[PDB]
């Protein structure tokens, strides 16, 4: 339909902008954006937490600490460790 948009678009009438695939830039901070409310220490590595999630989606960032928290939930801990986050790094990426 993007090419079918060109059927609707011999220039008339719209603006064409591309939606990007995710990259490590957002992966750092958009997780840090989701990391505001959660309980976590400042000893977490941003390098591996970002780069362990190539491709996937923006909805990947949602599932990062949720399912990681789900086991920490199940574990009852207050603030988590990156291992449990590393566990869900696999978990949400196990499916694909």
């Amino acid at each position: 339909d993007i090419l079918d948009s060109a059927l609707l678009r011999p220039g008339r009438i719209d603006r064409k902008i591309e939606f990007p695939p995710p990259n490590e830039e957002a992966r750092l901070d958009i997780l840090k954006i989701h990391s505001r409310k959660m309980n976590l220490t400042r000893g977490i590595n941003l390098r591996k937490i970002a780069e362990l999630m190539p491709g996937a989606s923006g909805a990947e960032v949602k599932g990062v600490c949720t399912e990681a928290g789900m086991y920490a939930l199940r574990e009852r801990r207050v603030h988590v460790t990156q291992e449990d986050f590393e566990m869900a790094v696999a978990k949400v990426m196990q499916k694909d």
Binding site: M38, L40, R77, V80
Partner: peptide
Amino acid sequence: DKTVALGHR
């Protein structure tokens, strides 16, 4: 104001 886990608290 730092520790996010109750174990250290």
